[PDB]
Design a protein around this nucleic acid. Structure first.
Lengths: 123, 150, 80, 205, 129, 82
RNA sequence: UAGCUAGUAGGUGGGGUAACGGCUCACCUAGGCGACGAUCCCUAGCUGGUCUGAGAGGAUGACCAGCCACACUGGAACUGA
RNA sequence: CCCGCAGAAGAAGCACCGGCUAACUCCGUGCCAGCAGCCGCGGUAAUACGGAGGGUGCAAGCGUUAAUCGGAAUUACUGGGCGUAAAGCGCACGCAGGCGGUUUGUUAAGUCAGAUGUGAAAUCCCCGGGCUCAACCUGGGAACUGCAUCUGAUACUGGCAA
C-alpha cells in the first residue's frame, strides 16, 4: 500500500481459473458416454436427473447433463458436450448438445426449440 | 412545479410476541427543477401511507443547490455512511448518467447532464444523503469570489 | 563534444581494467516514484591508475574484450 | 430489415400517434388508441426506469423506421460529432432521404416515401438515389424523376401535405415537384415531445 | 521526525480553520513564506507576519467569511515519499478553476493560473480548494 | 537497385497506387524507403487523379534510382505542370 | 530455484574474420556474474497494433506491415556480392 | 451501371415474457416430468415446468457455449484497507534501502521551457474527397504520451562547500 512496498512487491490478482476444463477452452467437445444414469439432486430439490458419463476426445472422463424430456442415449452414442453447470447435481459441469452427433432433438417440442435440437414443424 | 418521485419502498419487520409484524418504508425525493432538493424517509404500515409520510417529510427539509446553467459546477464528492459518491459537471455531457437512487435526486434537483459513479455501499437510503451532501457543499464562482475577496 | 558518463569504481582487481557502477535516477512507470538504479560496466583503462572507491568519467569505444566497450577519460574524486 | 406488420399496433403500444398511417383520413378514429396494445392492454403497465428509456428509443425508431444496429450507429456518429448528442441524433435522423421525401409531402407516410426512394423515383442533385438512409446535405435539391411524376400517390400525398405544419428548413414547392433541403433542422424545429436524453442515457449504460 | 514542514504548515492551517482559530504560528522558512505570500495574494489568508531573529516564526492571520471558514480544503500534493512534477500542459486546475494549486516553478512559487500563463510547469506543492 | 515504383493499395476492382521508393528486392506492398506520391487511375474527373513529388524523385534519380514504366509514364503525364 | 562461472573475467603475444572481440590458441594474472534476482525451472516468436476501459490500466499480438527463427530430424560446409 | 418487360408477384425467422429484465393469461403435469446465470420454481387452482393465445426484443439473422476486458474501488498508481469484519511482526537493536530541520554560495543530476534528429507505412482521432449511401478506399493534419543531443531557467529535490 505504501508506494515503496509496491515497488518492492507489486499488486497481483489471482488467475480465477475455469469452471469448465473442456480443455483448450473449446466451445464444444465430443465424447463417447461411457454410461447413462439418473441421479438424485441436492437437498431442497427432488427429481431423477438424466446424466451421462463421458470419455472425451481429449482424454478427460467427465459427467454431463442431458437436457429436455427424454433422450435416446445408450453407452456408445457419440455426443457433443457443451459447457454449463447444473447446480442442483453435485459435480456435473457440462451439458449435452441436443440435436448433435448421436443425440436427437427433443420429441414434440415447440418453444425454445433451437436449444433442444428440434426442427421447425411444417405448417 | 413540485416534481416528486419515489426511489425505494421496502418491507421491514419487527418480531413481537405473537409472530412478526411487517411495516413498509418509502424513500422519496422531491425538488422543483431548479436547485431546491429534498428527501424524505417515512414509514408506515401500508405502502400508500408510507409514501405519503415520505412526501410530506420531503416537502419540508429541502435544500438549496447552486446549479450552473443546467448542471453542476465543479466535480464534487459527497460521502455518507458507507456510501461514497463522485460527481462531475460534464459541461453539457449529455444526459443525467448516474446510478440508481442518484438519477432520481439529480433528476428532480434540476441538473440535467452530469457524470456520477457511486462507490462503496450503494444502499439507496445512504446514496442520497451522499448526493445532497455533495450538492450542498458545492459552491459557485460568485460564492468563492465572495469568500476570498476576488 | 562526446557523450560520457560518470560513476564510481565498484571493484578494481583486474589486469588493466576496472568496473564502474553508474547511478541513473529514473521514475517508476506505474507508481511515479523516482528510484535509483545502477548499471555496472566493465571499463578499460590503460595503466590502471584508478583504484577502488573512486569516481570516474567514461566514454564508449570499440569492443576491447567480452563485454568491455567503455574506456575512461578522467579520474576525479579518489578520496579515501 | 424493415418492420412489415401492423402499424397502428406500434402506434398503440407507445400511446402516441407515430404518424404511421397518415394517409387519407383524419385523426385515427379506428385504432382503439391507448386501450389495448395486446390482450392485457387494458392493464396500466406501471413502467420502470429502464422501461421509460427503452420505450423512448422504441418511439423514435418506430417513427423513423430504423432498426437497432443502424440506430445504434447513428448514436455513435451523433456522439462523436461536436455538440449536443440528442440534437445531433435527431439531425442524423432528419437528414435521411426517406424522411426528407416525407417532409416535402411526396409520400403520405414515411414507408410510402421509403418506397418512392426505394423504387428509383427520387433524384438528389440530378442523380437517382435508391437508398432509404442517404444523408441529405444542406442546400440540396431532391426531386421526383419523370417516371413516377404525375402518378397518383405523390399528388394525393401533396394533397395531405397542406394538412401538416410545413417545416421551416425546406423549400417544399409542389408545382415543379422539387424540394431544397436548405439547412439542418434545429432541435426546436421538430416535434417537441421526444426526450432524447432518455436515449442518450439508454445507450450510455 | 519532521520530514515535511510544508504539509505541517498546511496541517496547521486546516486545524486552525477547523478550531476557529484566529491566527496560526509555526517555524518559518523561505518556502513557507513563498507559499504564504501566494495564499495571501489569492485571498485564502488574511495576513502573514514573520518575526524573530535567530528562530523565525511565521504567523498567519486566517480568514473566515461567514461563520464558515475560507480555506475549504488544503491538501499536500508533492509529498517527500513521492514528488509530483507537472509540465505546463499537465498542470491541473482545482475545483474547475475555483481553487488554486500552488506550483513551484523555476521562476518562483506561483499558482496554476499564473504559471500556466507564464508558460512553464513545475513541482506542484498543494491544492487549495 | 532502388526503384521508384507503384504499390497497389485500394480495394478490390478499385486500385489506388502509391508511388514509393523501395529497395527493388522487397515485396510490392512491403518495405519502402519513402513514399513520394500517388496515382489513382479513377479518382473521378475532378481535379487531380495523381500528385507526385518531383523534387524527391529528382533526388533519388540523382542517387541512382531506377524508375518503372508507369512512374516514367506519370512523370511524362504531369510533365512540369501538365 | 541463492549461489553460478576455468575460455570462465582480464592482460600480453601469435593466429583468424570483411570487421572489433576469448572469436581461437600459448602464457600470465584470479577474476567475473548475483538478492537492482545471477543460475535453474515452466511458458513464449517480438513489434506497429487489436479488444476492452472514462482513464490509468488489463488481455492479446488472427488479417495487414517491420524484424527474427525454422524448412522431415541431427550436423556440416561448397558455390556466391 | 443504364433502359425496357411481366406481375405483389420469388423472398421472416430466432430468443424471451417470476425478480434482476422490456413483455401475461388459460390449459396439461402435481417434489413428477422437468427449468435454472444468481435468487430459486414444481408435493392440484404453477405469470418460473410443457403446450396454446397474446406480447416483448432483435432481425437474415437469432440464441447457446468458449474466451477477453468491463462492471470489480473484489490487488485500489489514478483508486481500498488493518480496535471488534481478513489484516499491526511478541518486543527491541540495526546493516543495505526509503525519507530528512534551517541559512548562504556554487553546480544543474532530477525538474521545467524551447530547438533539432528520430519515433516506418497502415490503424485510432480531426477536417475534406471517391464508390448511388454505408461498410470500404483515400488527401492533408493531429497523434505516436518516448528517447537522444543542444540551448536556457534555478523555485523545489539532489551533489559540493560553509
Amino acid at each position: 500500500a505504501t508506494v515503496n512496498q509496491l515497488v518492492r512487491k507489486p499488486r497481483a490478482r489471482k488467475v480465477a481459473k475455469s469452471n469448465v476444463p473442456a480443455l483448450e477452452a473449446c466451445p464444444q467437445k465430443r465424447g463417447v458416454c461411457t454410461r447413462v444414469y439418473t441421479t438424485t439432486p441436492k437437498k431442497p430439490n427432488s427429481a431423477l436427473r438424466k446424466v451421462c458419463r463421458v470419455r472425451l476426445t481429449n482424454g478427460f472422463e467427465v459427467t454431463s447433463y442431458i437436457g429436455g424430456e427424454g433422450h435416446n442415449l445408450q453407452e456408445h452414442s457419440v455426443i457433443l458436450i457443451r459447457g454449463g453447470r447444473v447446480k442442483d447435481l453435485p459435480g456435473v459441469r457440462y451439458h449435452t448438445v441436443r440435436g448433435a452427433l448421436d443425440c436427437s432433438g427433443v420429441k414434440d417440442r415447440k418453444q425454445a426449440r433451437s436449444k433442444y435440437g428440434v426442427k421447425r414443424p411444417k405448417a | 412545479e413540485l416534481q416528486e418521485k419515489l426511489i425505494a419502498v421496502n418491507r421491514v419487520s419487527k418480531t413481537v410476541k405473537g409472530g412478526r409484524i411487517f411495516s413498509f418504508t418509502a424513500l422519496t425525493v422531491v425538488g422543483d427543477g431548479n436547485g431546491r432538493v429534498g428527501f424524505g424517509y417515512g414509514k408506515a404500515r401500508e405502502v400508500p401511507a408510507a409514501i405519503q409520510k415520505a412526501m410530506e417529510k420531503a416537502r419540508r427539509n429541502m435544500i438549496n443547490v447552486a446549479l450552473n446553467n443546467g448542471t453542476l459546477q465543479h466535480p464534487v464528492k459527497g460521502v455518507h455512511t458507507g456510501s461514497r459518491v463522485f460527481m462531475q459537471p460534464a459541461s453539457e455531457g449529455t444526459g443525467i448518467i448516474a446510478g440508481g437512487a442518484m438519477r432520481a435526486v439529480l433528476e428532480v434537483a434540476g441538473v440535467h447532464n452530469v457524470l456520477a459513479k457511486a462507490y462503496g455501499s450503494t444502499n439507496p437510503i445512504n446514496v442520497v444523503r451522499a448526493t445532497i451532501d455533495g450538492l450542498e457543499n458545492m459552491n459557485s464562482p460568485e460564492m468563492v469570489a465572495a469568500k476570498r475577496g476576488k | 563534444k562526446i557523450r560520457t558518463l560518470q560513476g564510481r569504481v565498484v571493484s578494481d582487481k583486474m589486469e588493466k581494467s576496472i568496473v564502474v557502477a553508474i547511478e541513473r535516477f529514473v521514475k517508476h512507470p506505474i507508481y511515479g516514484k523516482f528510484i535509483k538504479r545502477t548499471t555496472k560496466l566493465h571499463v578499460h583503462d590503460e595503466n590502471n591508475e584508478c583504484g577502488i572507491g573512486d569516481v570516474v568519467e567514461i566514454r564508449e569505444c570499440r569492443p576491447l574484450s567480452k563485454t568491455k566497450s567503455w574506456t575512461l577519460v578522467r579520474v576525479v574524486e579518489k578520496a579515501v | 430489415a424493415r418492420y412489415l406488420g401492423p402499424k397502428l399496433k406500434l402506434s398503440r403500444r407507445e400511446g402516441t400517434d407515430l404518424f404511421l398511417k397518415s394517409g387519407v383520413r383524419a385523426i385515427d378514429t379506428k385504432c382503439k388508441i391507448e386501450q389495448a396494445p395486446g390482450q392485457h392492454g387494458a392493464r396500466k403497465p406501471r413502467l420502470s426506469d429502464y422501461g421509460v428509456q427503452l420505450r423512448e428509443k422504441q418511439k423514435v425508431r418506430r417513427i423513423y423506421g430504423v432498426l437497432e444496429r443502424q440506430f445504434r450507429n447513428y448514436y455513435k456518429e451523433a456522439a462523436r460529432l461536436k455538440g449536443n448528442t440528442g440534437e445531433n441524433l435527431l439531425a442524423l435522423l432528419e437528414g435521411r432521404l426517406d424522411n426528407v421525401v416525407y417532409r416535402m409531402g411526396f409520400g403520405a407516410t414515411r414507408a410510402e416515401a421509403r418506397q418512392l426512394v426505394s423504387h428509383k423515383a427520387i433524384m438528389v442533385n440530378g442523380r437517382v438515389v435508391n437508398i432509404a438512409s442517404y444523408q441529405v446535405s444542406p442546400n440540396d435539391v431532391v426531386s421526383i424523376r419523370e417516371k413516377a411524376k404525375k402518378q397518383s400517390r405523390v399528388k394525393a400525398a401533396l394533397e395531405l401535405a397542406e394538412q401538416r405544419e410545413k417545416p421551416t428548413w425546406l423549400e417544399v414547392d409542389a408545382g415543379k415537384m422539387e424540394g431544397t433541403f436548405k439547412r439542418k433542422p434545429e432541435r426546436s424545429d421538430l416535434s417537441a415531445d421526444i426526450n432524447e436524453h432518455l436515449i442518450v442515457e439508454l445507450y450510455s449504460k | 521526525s519532521m520530514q515535511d514542514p510544508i504539509a505541517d504548515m498546511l496541517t496547521r492551517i486546516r486545524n486552525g480553520q477547523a478550531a476557529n482559530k484566529a491566527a496560526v504560528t509555526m517555524p518559518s522558512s523561505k518556502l513557507k513564506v513563498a507559499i504564504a505570500n501566494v495564499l495571501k495574494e489569492e485571498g485564502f489568508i488574511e495576513d502573514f507576519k514573520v518575526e524573530g531573529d535567530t528562530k523565525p516564526e511565521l504567523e498567519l492571520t486566517l480568514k473566515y467569511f461567514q461563520g464558515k471558514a475560507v480555506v475549504e480544503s488544503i491538501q499536500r500534493v508533492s509529498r517527500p515519499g513521492l514528488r509530483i512534477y507537472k509540465r505546463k500542459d499537465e498542470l491541473p486546475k482545482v475545483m474547475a478553476g475555483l481553487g488554486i494549486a500552488v506550483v513551484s516553478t523555476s521562476k518562483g512559487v506561483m499558482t496554476d493560473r499564473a504559471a500556466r500563463q507564464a508558460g512553464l510547469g513545475g513541482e506542484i506543492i498543494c491544492y487549495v480548494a | 537497385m532502388v526503384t521508384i515504383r507503384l504499390a497497389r493499395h485500394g480495394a478490390k476492382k478499385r486500385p489506388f497506387y502509391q508511388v514509393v521508393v523501395a529497395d527493388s528486392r522487397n515485396a510490392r506492398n512491403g518495405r519502402f524507403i519513402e513514399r513520394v506520391g500517388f496515382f489513382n487511375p479513377i479518382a473521378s474527373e475532378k481535379e487531380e487523379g495523381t500528385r507526385l513529388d518531383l523534387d524527391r524523385i529528382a533526388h533519388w534519380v540523382g542517387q541512382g534510382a531506377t524508375i518503372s514504366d508507369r512512374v516514367a509514364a506519370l512523370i511524362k503525364e504531369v510533365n512540369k505542370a501538365a
